[PDB]
């Protein structure tokens, strides 16, 4: 499986999830099962935690190719979480069994997608650039913010989500958007 788009809407009111199953000839039997949303408070290593933020079952929406593609637009204010200072973790699962000719490693039933609001980072960069316009000196806080973002990106890409949570809570938690 894979994500088509996974972002918070530009108006900071919806959390957009658009999932699809991969198009190979050996995934015809594989469908989509459920979508589970977790935050930086409830996240756990081994799969979605108990008491998640938002559980979604795909059978309910549809009445077979329809179940291979799913799109959602979750009003974040209905989830009772802050769109500015929240790190959503989106798990997806597959109610299927791939063929026997599946190459080794491609039969991964679960995926994960981390979401943050990019608006506060954009505004912070604009503030730092405005400060740079005065006397053409780069603030050290600006380089710090850039490198801390790169650290969180590396933590996400290597799968080390808890240390990414520590960095996010410690460095980027207070955000205005």
């Amino acid at each position: 499986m894979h994500f088509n788009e996974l972002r918070i809407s530009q108006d900071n009111r919806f959390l957009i999830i658009d999932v699809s199953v991969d198009n190979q000839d050996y995934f015809e039997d594989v469908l989509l099962d459920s979508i589970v949303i977790d935050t930086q408070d409830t996240f756990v290593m081994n799969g979605p935690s108990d008491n998640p933020l938002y559980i979604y079952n795909v059978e309910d929406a549809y009445d077979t190719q329809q179940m291979k593609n799913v799109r959602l637009e979750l009003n974040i204010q209905d989830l009772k979480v802050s769109p500015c200072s929240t790190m959503f973790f989106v798990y997806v699962k597959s109610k299927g069994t791939p063929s026997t000719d599946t190459p080794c490693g491609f039969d991964k039933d679960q995926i994960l997608g981390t979401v943050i609001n990019l608006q506060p980072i954009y505004k912070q960069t604009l503030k730092y650039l405005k400060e740079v316009e005065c006397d053409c000196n780069i603030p050290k806080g600006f380089i710090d913010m850039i490198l801390k973002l790169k650290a969180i990106e590396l933590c996400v890409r290597t799968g080390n989500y808890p240390q990414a949570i520590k960095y996010w809570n410690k460095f980027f938690i207070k955000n205005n958007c």
């Binding site: 459920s34 589970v36 979605p48 798990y91 039933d109």
Partner: peptide, 19 residues
């Protein structure tokens, strides 16, 4: 965790191996 349905089938299946 979030157990899938097939996992519960797997667990009962493996328990009834020792039937």
């Amino acid at each position: 965790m979030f157990f899938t349905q097939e996992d519960y089938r797997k667990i009962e299946k493996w328990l009834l191996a020792n039937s």
